[PDB]
């Protein structure tokens, strides 16, 4: 098994997303989880996001049924300003504002998640939390795949995945994965559309040199729903005891969302001799996104709309059933070039076997935004009272009306025009000194992250050149009985793009995490079990000014302590299992307002279990029947902890039938169902005016062929 390739069972022993060097997960001192291409081709995820529900320590409903972004909340933490923190092949997909990219799961070989500080090898990063996707690469043997989807909400995807070699020796091979997927969103009137193709090509001038060219070109005319809904009408009943339907849409009829992605790069390794191997990863990309959208702000009786005129023009006891709305027109575009180069030194010194890593990582990102935002009374209120029982059962709600957008009035709105620039360069060193049954990993990294933002309208330019250092130390006790005890100390760091009252960019926040755990990785069977418990802390977090002045004051702190366990196995050539449990206790240690409060959108309890079975005998030969469930506990739906979003449990199940029995081995047809008991839940709220209906039971019929 190769960190950059498949894994046989959904139990991957080898991963590189932790030490930058291909290593057994047991020998890795930090919490790593790996979702196989197999595990994915089991649920037919819509996004890398969804592909992560049986993964401890990760929420994915931080936006309910919406998939515009693979924004995740790992260990109760996430990037500042709702941006992602997603990596693709050891290089970060740095985005900014509504400009974050996503890669389709069907072009991925595996999706990996590293919990805890990751700055030691990657640079600036949100405390505890990284996602790294592995592009699919050329296969050893030919691959002729054609896949056909068809599911609820008029979902229809048609894609392929091919790979072969030009010569007979394989010095020249490639791969071309691509798909066309279209469907209707959960919310009425909203649509989803994606067109993606991934060209790959690997030159192996021998058996010590490897150069894979990895490109991904994606285009999405319409990205789907991305609006907010009041706790009033979702989590809590509306005045008239009725709630808004799960498919209710509060945005304009002419609401539009689009994103375009284009990236070319390569991964390359070369082994010179017995002690030195060099590898370099590089990617350039330019991505754009534009949108015309009317989102929602709470009900008129919601504090936020305190200064809304249209709101304060309704009978004082009529405000709790009317919705305030705002809008935004955006159109951005950014380029992101990245390169990582590293030298691996394999040598010893009297029984101390060494694996020393030394490397420089560099990147720059430039984003140009030209948006427009609607403020109070910027768009006609909505009488939410209407959605009743005729909108629930006997049909669903109806698409509201168009909206202007073009006629940007100076009263209700104004312009937003910024140009954020980003640049980071870092050097790191790490040694995987294995001294017999005592693998001890250690290393650190220095960083030069400089930023610069130009506000067009305001004609300003704030900029800050941060320089930080991070290191991580840990040990793993290799027991021959499979068990591998371990513990480690790690650090992270993340700059602020925010400006203080002193007209200056706040100094970055930090991350310190203490973690210990056990990794069961028996060499005989294909089963992996990991358990771990940690104490993660975020420093210098921004908090409300003690004097209250529109400007926030740094100094706040937050702690995240918890326990995580996950398990994936191959209990039989017919039985396969995956499950996990997550205990997450996140708290404000220091903060002007909130303190001791739990951050919204992060539940204390989370657990998931899923198992499949394939019959290789009875008249049900070539038949897999699988099912599972994901549980998310109650969570606070706003910083003040005003209310709570109620816990829920959704069931998943599937059935596949190996089409071999019709002269088509390797092929098959499958049926996947999510939220089997078409449950109704509220994924979460990030505030009183921002709640998201969970995904309403979905069913997909997939046929995938292998020539």
From Swiss-Prot:
It is a multi-pass membrane protein. Keywords: Cell outer membrane, Disulfide bond, Ion transport, Iron, Iron transport, Membrane, Receptor, Signal, TonB box, Transmembrane, Transmembrane beta strand, Transport. One of its GO terms (biological process) is intracellular iron ion homeostasis. Residues 151-155, 181-194, 218-261, 285-336, 363-424, 447-468, 492-511, 535-561, 583-605, 631-649, 675-697 are extracellular. It is found in: Cell outer membrane. The record marks 526 as: Interaction with phage T5 RBP-pb5. The chain crosses the membrane at residues 142-150, 156-164, 172-180, 195-204, 209-217, 262-270, 276-284, 337-345, 354-362, 425-433, 438-446, 469-477, 483-491, 512-520, 526-534, 562-570, 574-582, 606-614, 622-630, 650-658, 666-674, 698-706. Residues 141-707 form the TBDR beta-barrel domain. CDD domains: ligand_gated_channel. GO terms for cellular component: cell outer membrane; membrane; transmembrane transporter complex. Ferrichrome binds at residues 63, 82, 97-98, 226-228, 295-297, 373, 695. Disulfide bonds join 300-311, 685-691. GO terms for molecular function: iron ion binding; protein domain specific binding; siderophore uptake transmembrane transporter activity; signaling receptor activity; toxic substance binding; virion binding. Binding of ferrichrome or colicin M enhances the interaction between FhuA and TonB. TonB activates FhuA through interaction with the beta-barrel. It comes from the Bacteria. Residues 1-141, 165-171, 205-208, 271-275, 346-353, 434-437, 478-482, 521-525, 571-573, 615-621, 659-665, 707 are periplasmic. Induction: Induced 1.6-fold by hydroxyurea. A motif (TonB C-terminal box) lies at residues 690-707. InterPro entries: Plug_dom (IPR012910), Plug_dom_sf (IPR037066), TonB-dep_rcpt-like (IPR039426), TonB-dep_rcpt_b-brl (IPR000531), TonB_box_CS (IPR010916), TonB_rcpt_b-brl_sf (IPR036942), TonB_rcpt_CS (IPR010917), TonB_sidphr_rcpt (IPR010105). Residues 24-136 form the TBDR plug domain. Belongs to the TonB-dependent receptor family. Has two distinct conformations in the presence and absence of ferrichrome. The globular N-terminal domain acts a plug that closes the channel formed by the beta-barrel. Binding of ferrichrome at the cell surface induces a conformational change in FhuA, but does not open the channel. Structural changes are propagated and amplified across the plug, and may facilitate binding of FhuA to TonB. TonB binding promotes conformational changes in outer surface-exposed loops of FhuA. Phage T5 is a TonB-independent ligand, and its binding to FhuA results in the formation of high conductance ion channels. Involved in the uptake of iron in complex with ferrichrome, a hydroxamate-type siderophore. Binds and transports ferrichrome-iron across the outer membrane. In addition to its role in ferrichrome-iron transport, transports the antibiotic albomycin, which is a structural analog of ferrichrome, and acts as a receptor for colicin M, microcin J25 and bacteriophages T1, T5, phi80 and UC-1. The energy source, which is required for all FhuA functions except infection by phage T5, is provided by the inner membrane TonB system. This is Ferrichrome outer membrane transporter/phage receptor.
């Amino acid at each position: 098994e190769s960190a950059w390739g498949p894994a046989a069972t959904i139990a991957a022993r080898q991963s590189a997303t932790g030490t930058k060097t291909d290593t057994p997960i047991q020998k890795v001192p930090q919490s790593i989880s790996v979702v196989t291409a197999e595990e994915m081709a089991l649920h037919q995820p819509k996004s890398v996001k969804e592909a992560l529900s049986y993964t401890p320590g990760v929420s994915v409903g931080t936006r309910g049924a919406s998939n515009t972004y693979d924004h995740l909340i790992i260990r109760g933490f996430a990037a500042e300003g709702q941006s992602q923190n997603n990596y693709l092949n050891g290089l970060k997909l740095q985005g900014n504002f509504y400009n974050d990219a996503v890669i389709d799961p069907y072009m991925l070989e595996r999706a990996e998640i590293m919990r805890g500080p990751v700055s030691v090898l990657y640079g600036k990063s949100s405390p505890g939390g990284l996602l790294n996707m592995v592009s699919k690469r050329p296969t050893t043997e030919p691959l002729k795949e054609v896949q056909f989807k068809a599911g609820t909400d008029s979902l229809f995807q048609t894609g392929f995945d091919f790979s072969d070699s030009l010569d007979d020796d394989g010095v020249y091979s490639y791969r071309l994965t691509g798909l066309a997927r279209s469907a209707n969103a959960q919310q009425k009137g909203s649509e989803e559309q994606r067109y993606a193709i991934a060209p790959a090509f690997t030159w192996r001038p021998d058996d010590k040199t490897n150069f894979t060219f990895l490109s991904y070109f994606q285009n999405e005319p319409e990205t789907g729903y991305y609006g907010w809904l009041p706790k009033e009408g979702t989590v809590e009943p509306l005045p008239n005891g009725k709630r808004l339907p799960t498919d209710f849409n509060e945005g304009a009829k002419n609401n539009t969302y689009s994103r375009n992605e284009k990236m070319v790069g390569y991964s390359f390794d070369h082994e010179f001799n017995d002690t030195f191997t060099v590898r370099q990863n590089l990617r350039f990309a330019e991505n754009k996104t534009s949108q015309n959208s009317v989102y929602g702000y709470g009900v008129c009786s919601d504090p936020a709309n305190a200064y809304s005129k249209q709101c304060a023009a309704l009978a004082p006891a009529d405000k709790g059933h009317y919705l305030a709305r705002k809008y935004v027109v955006d159109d951005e575009k950014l380029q992101n070039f990245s390169v990582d180069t590293q030298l691996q030194s394999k040598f010893a010194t009297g029984d101390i076997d060494h694996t020393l890593l030394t490397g420089v990582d560099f990147m720059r990102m430039r984003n140009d935004i030209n948006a427009w935002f609607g403020y109070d009374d910027s768009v006609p209120l909505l009488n939410l009272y209407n959605p009743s029982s005729h909108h629930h059962h006997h049909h669903g709600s109806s698409v509201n009306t168009d909206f202007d957008f073009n006629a940007k009035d100076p009263a209700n709105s104004g312009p937003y025009r910024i140009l954020n620039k980003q640049k980071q360069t870092g050097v790191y060193v790490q040694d995987q000194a294995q001294w017999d049954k005592v693998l001890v990993t250690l290393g650190g990294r220095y960083d030069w992250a400089d930023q610069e933002s130009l506000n067009r309208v305001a004609g300003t330019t704030d900029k800050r050149d941060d320089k930080q250092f991070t290191w991580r130390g840990g040990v793993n006790y290799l027991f021959d009985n499979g068990v591998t005890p371990y513990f480690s100390y790690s650090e992270s760091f993340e700059p602020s793009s925010q400006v203080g009252k002193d007209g200056n960019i706040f100094a970055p926040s930090k991350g310190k995490q203490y973690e210990v755990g056990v990794k069961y990785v028996p060499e005989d069977r294909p089963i992996v079990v990991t358990g771990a418990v940690y104490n993660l802390t975020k420093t210098n977090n921004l908090m409300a000014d003690p004097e209250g002045s529109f400007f926030s004051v740094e100094g706040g702190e937050i702690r995240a302590r918890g326990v995580e366990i996950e398990a994936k196995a191959a209990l039989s050539a017919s039985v396969n299992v995956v499950g996990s449990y997550t205990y997450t206790d996140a708290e404000y240690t220091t903060d002007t307002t909130y303190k001791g409060n739990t951050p919204a959108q992060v539940p204390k309890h989370m657990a998931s279990l899923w198992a499949d079975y394939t019959f290789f005998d009875g008249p049900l030969s070539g038949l897999t029947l699988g099912t599972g469930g994901r549980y998310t506990g109650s969570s606070y739906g706003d910083p003040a902890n005003s209310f709570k979003v109620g816990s829920y449990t959704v069931v998943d199940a599937l059935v596949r039938y190996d089409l071999a029995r019709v002269g088509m081995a390797g092929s098959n047809v499958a049926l996947h169902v999510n939220n089997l008991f078409d449950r109704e839940y509220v994924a979460s709220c990030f505030n009183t005016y921002g709640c998201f209906w969970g995904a309403e039971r979905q069913v997909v019929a997939t046929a995938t062929f292998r020539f």
